[PDB]
Design a protein around this ligand. Sequence first.
Ligand SMILES: *[C@@H]1O[C@H](CO)[C@@H](O[C@@H]2O[C@H](CO)[C@@H](O[C@@H]3O[C@H](CO[C@H]4O[C@H](CO[C@H]5O[C@H](CO)[C@@H](O)[C@H](O)[C@@H]5O)[C@@H](O)[C@H](O[C@H]5O[C@H](CO)[C@@H](O)[C@H](O)[C@@H]5O)[C@@H]4O)[C@@H](O)[C@H](O[C@H]4O[C@H](CO)[C@@H](O)[C@H](O)[C@@H]4O)[C@@H]3O)[C@H](O)[C@H]2NC(C)=O)[C@H](O)[C@H]1NC(C)=O
Ligand SMILES: *[C@@H]1O[C@H](CO)[C@@H](O[C@@H]2O[C@H](CO)[C@@H](O[C@@H]3O[C@H](CO[C@H]4O[C@H](CO[C@H]5O[C@H](CO)[C@@H](O)[C@H](O)[C@@H]5O)[C@@H](O)[C@H](O[C@H]5O[C@H](CO)[C@@H](O)[C@H](O)[C@@H]5O)[C@@H]4O)[C@@H](O)[C@H](O[C@H]4O[C@H](CO)[C@@H](O)[C@H](O)[C@@H]4O)[C@@H]3O)[C@H](O)[C@H]2NC(C)=O)[C@H](O)[C@H]1NC(C)=O
Ligand SMILES: *[C@@H]1O[C@H](CO)[C@@H](O[C@@H]2O[C@H](CO)[C@@H](O[C@@H]3O[C@H](CO[C@H]4O[C@H](CO[C@H]5O[C@H](CO)[C@@H](O)[C@H](O)[C@@H]5O)[C@@H](O)[C@H](O[C@H]5O[C@H](CO)[C@@H](O)[C@H](O)[C@@H]5O)[C@@H]4O)[C@@H](O)[C@H](O[C@H]4O[C@H](CO)[C@@H](O)[C@H](O)[C@@H]4O)[C@@H]3O)[C@H](O)[C@H]2NC(C)=O)[C@H](O)[C@H]1NC(C)=O
Ligand code: NAG
Ligand code: NAG
Ligand code: NAG
Ligand code: NAG
Lengths: 110, 130, 51, 129, 129, 129
Amino acid sequence: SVLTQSASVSGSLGQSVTISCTGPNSVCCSHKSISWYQWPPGRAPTLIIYEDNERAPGISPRFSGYKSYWSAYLTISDLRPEDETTYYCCSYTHNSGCVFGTGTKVSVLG
Amino acid sequence: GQLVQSGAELKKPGASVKISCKTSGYRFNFYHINWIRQTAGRGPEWMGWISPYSGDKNLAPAFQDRVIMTTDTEVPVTSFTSTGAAYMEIRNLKFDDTGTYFCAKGLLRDGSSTWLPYLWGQGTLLTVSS
Amino acid sequence: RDGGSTNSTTETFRPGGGDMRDNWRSELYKYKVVKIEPLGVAPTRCKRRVV
Amino acid sequence: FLGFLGAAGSTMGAASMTLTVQARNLLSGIVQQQSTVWGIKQLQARVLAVERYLRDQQLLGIWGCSGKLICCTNVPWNSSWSNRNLSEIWDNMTWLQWDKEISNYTQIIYGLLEESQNQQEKNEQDLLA
Amino acid sequence: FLGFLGAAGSTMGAASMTLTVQARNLLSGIVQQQSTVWGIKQLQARVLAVERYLRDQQLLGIWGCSGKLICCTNVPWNSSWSNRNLSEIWDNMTWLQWDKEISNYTQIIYGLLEESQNQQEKNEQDLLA
Amino acid sequence: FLGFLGAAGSTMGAASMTLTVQARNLLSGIVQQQSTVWGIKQLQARVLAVERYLRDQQLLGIWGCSGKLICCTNVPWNSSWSNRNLSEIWDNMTWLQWDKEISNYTQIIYGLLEESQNQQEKNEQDLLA
Ligand SMILES: *[C@@H]1O[C@H](CO)[C@@H](O[C@@H]2O[C@H](CO)[C@@H](O[C@@H]3O[C@H](CO[C@H]4O[C@H](CO[C@H]5O[C@H](CO)[C@@H](O)[C@H](O)[C@@H]5O)[C@@H](O)[C@H](O[C@H]5O[C@H](CO)[C@@H](O)[C@H](O)[C@@H]5O)[C@@H]4O)[C@@H](O)[C@H](O[C@H]4O[C@H](CO)[C@@H](O)[C@H](O)[C@@H]4O)[C@@H]3O)[C@H](O)[C@H]2NC(C)=O)[C@H](O)[C@H]1NC(C)=O
Ligand SMILES: *[C@@H]1O[C@H](CO)[C@@H](O[C@@H]2O[C@H](CO)[C@@H](O[C@@H]3O[C@H](CO[C@H]4O[C@H](CO[C@H]5O[C@H](CO)[C@@H](O)[C@H](O)[C@@H]5O)[C@@H](O)[C@H](O[C@H]5O[C@H](CO)[C@@H](O)[C@H](O)[C@@H]5O)[C@@H]4O)[C@@H](O)[C@H](O[C@H]4O[C@H](CO)[C@@H](O)[C@H](O)[C@@H]4O)[C@@H]3O)[C@H](O)[C@H]2NC(C)=O)[C@H](O)[C@H]1NC(C)=O
Ligand SMILES: *[C@@H]1O[C@H](CO)[C@@H](O[C@@H]2O[C@H](CO)[C@@H](O[C@@H]3O[C@H](CO[C@H]4O[C@H](CO[C@H]5O[C@H](CO)[C@@H](O)[C@H](O)[C@@H]5O)[C@@H](O)[C@H](O[C@H]5O[C@H](CO)[C@@H](O)[C@H](O)[C@@H]5O)[C@@H]4O)[C@@H](O)[C@H](O[C@H]4O[C@H](CO)[C@@H](O)[C@H](O)[C@@H]4O)[C@@H]3O)[C@H](O)[C@H]2NC(C)=O)[C@H](O)[C@H]1NC(C)=O
Ligand SMILES: *[C@@H]1O[C@H](CO)[C@@H](O)[C@H](O)[C@H]1NC(C)=O
Ligand SMILES: *[C@@H]1O[C@H](CO)[C@@H](O)[C@H](O)[C@H]1NC(C)=O
Ligand SMILES: *[C@@H]1O[C@H](CO)[C@@H](O)[C@H](O)[C@H]1NC(C)=O
Ligand SMILES: *[C@@H]1O[C@H](CO)[C@@H](O)[C@H](O)[C@H]1NC(C)=O
């Protein structure tokens, strides 16, 4: 769609990794909420991030969200084997359903 | 709480199919029920949401004329949980409509993201073929 | 009801008025008594002014 | 305005903005013409209402909140009571299930409140040169 | 000092300087030796006194004035209640004819008071960084 | 912690640090199943407790201390009441013999308190431009 993410990213065990999420001003970013989901292929997703920054219940503090004027980001610190999967961002406000990004597959090396 | 969706259906293109989403473990009347789909060709696509409490619906423009979302009235279990059922009927199926469909419970009763899909069901696989 | 016979064959119903309380239940079925606990403690990001 | 207990099913914040209706309609005063079993009843009920009210006001005062309604304390929220963040508590639960979730630790919170207020007052006594 | 209700005919200000006498002598406590019709009476009257007192204290607290006596509010005096200036009110009328002139609009003033205080407390809750 | 009246024989300061235990355990609430001489008794006793409590709270409020426990005043300690210095009073006498030594002049102190508070409130009324 019009919301573009980095197609692929990889990080080593115990380190961090950042996923990007950007698009036209019609979808991003200022005055628009961003959410992050962990979405393994073929399965139902899990909400990681809502309201840009605010993490979902039970989510580890290793996950953090941050939104600038031009792009949004999701930062995974202290990478683990379970972090190796597919992640999606969403652009939303209140009256408009989710608009998903192009997707990023995270690989955990080492 | 648990969201249990109908299993799977095979439908020919041009036909219609109705997916169900039975809920339990939470107050069905309070959280919005969203319908989101996933296909291999176009990725994740949000279809719409419906309020079990008021009946208010919000459909994405791409599905406003071929998707019908309905809900039943919540069946009380104790006081803080209930069981319910929502349905989504999609018609005029095409090959690109083949994929997995999800119903999802909202995040908060009030706030800046009330409808935000938070608790998801296991999904219903819809295949359109001859 | 009568005493349980061979099951599911036939059921017999006789009228009774054994007690008067059932009449009160017949009109008190919709009501219930509760006491108000107006004391709630909840977390906010608020501290009192330091002395 | 919804009335007495109108926001019982509302979010804790929606009810919190209108706690004053429930708090005010808590005390009645239903005159008399008993001048009998009914009289014994009406007299007994009379006492219990203001009795609970005064117990609650006693608790409010021994926490530094005799002015009623909304007040803050020096007691930090120990995470062991509940692990939910602010958004979840104030926009996902009602006051009923909240008090159900925290009834295990209510009296400990009350003790922490009374002790923090007593230490504040001891500081006030120390607070002159 | 004039005594209980001594300034009933005085100007509203002259009585206002000595409201505390009337307020204090409002609660008694007249022991007992009832250990009977007379006992039923004395017990019934006992309740009503502190009942009215606690209703008034409830009103004082739900207006931000649980400390009693004299307090100010954020509610402006709508001219429709009374059109008299300050000198006339405080040096020409007594409290009796005053409450007669304002009894039409007393409850509206009470509601304005409670709501202004509730908004002040919501602001207090907002008032931290 | 020693319990209700545990510091009765302690120094006035040692008891003063833990007045809150005695103050809290002052109000009970002992349910019922009276549904009789015993009932008349239990009902009569019920009233007297909160009656004394409300008389004391009335006194606290008409002294500018409706928040209970510890408060200060503008009334100077006239030496005629007691001639002992601070160390002697707070570390040589208990509250019992203290109230015995000052019972002669208690009501005069109460009047001074009420009047100082009333003058403070009149100043508050004067206190706007
Ligand atoms: C009992 O429980 C129920 C269920 O839990 C609860 O209902 C929830 O209440 C909360 C808050 O009270 C709701 O959260 C708020 O929702 C507000 C309403 O959403 C608006 O958007 C809908 C979509 O509009 C699109 O589509 C329409 C066409 O359909 C189109 O015209 C529009 O332009 C737009 O494109 C809209 O349909 C909806 O309309 C319903 O409600 C209005 C009244 O608002 C009514 O006129 C309609 O007929 C219809 O019934 C509505 O317009 C939303 O405004 C709000 O967001 C603002 O407020 C929050 C603060 O609350 C701010 O933080 C935020 O920044 C916004 O400024 C908020 O999201 C929740 O959606 C309800 N439903 C749930 C949870 O399922 C009751 O309140 C409870 N009652 C009691 C007494 O306890
Ligand atoms: C019950 O109701 C009645 C009636 O309404 C009410 O009486 C009114 O009370 C108010 C205030 O309480 C009075 O208003 C005050 O009046 C004060 C008194 O006026 C003085 O002046 C008189 C004139 O003196 C001249 O003439 C004499 C010779 O006659 C001469 O020697 C003098 O030098 C001078 O030239 C004088 O006669 C009068 O004397 C009476 O009263 C005194 C006690 O004060 C007494 O000793 C006498 O025997 C005689 O009875 C008096 O001396 C006046 O001082 C005052 O002005 C000051 O105070 C106000 C604040 O109150 C300040 O703002 C102001 O700047 C001044 O400093 C004020 O004007 C009013 O006059 C009364 N009469 C009415 C209204 O008709 C009672 O109080 C009510 N009682 C209750 C319990 O409710
Ligand atoms: C009921 O009434 C009684 C009687 O009035 C009252 O007891 C008095 O209580 C007050 C305060 O509550 C006491 O005043 C305090 O005394 C403290 C204790 O004194 C210490 O010093 C003794 C001497 O030690 C030497 O010798 C030993 C060998 O014997 C040696 O090892 C040492 O190194 C040292 O050289 C010591 O024996 C004594 O020990 C007793 O008490 C301890 C507990 O403290 C216990 O473990 C022992 O088994 C033994 O019973 C003790 O160690 C003293 O610490 C204190 O001074 C500090 O506190 C004050 C504030 O209170 C500060 O201002 C000050 O700067 C110090 O930091 C203070 O002097 C008083 O002595 C008691 N006795 C009297 C008056 O006769 C009870 O409390 C009352 N109870 C109630 C409920 O009302
Ligand atoms: C918020 O929730 C997390 C877990 O969801 C918890 O660990 C944390 O203590 C809570 N409070 C915060 C982050 O202030
Ligand atoms: C918080 O609660 C735990 C468990 O009840 C307790 O051990 C601890 O002392 C409390 N206070 C803290 C962690 O400050
Ligand atoms: C004052 O009173 C009038 C008449 O009762 C009313 O119309 C008005 O809304 C009130 N408030 C004002 C004028 O601010
Ligand atoms: C103090 O008490 C004495 C005797 O009771 C009294 O005469 C005096 O007026 C009082 N006030 C003082 C000295 O300020």
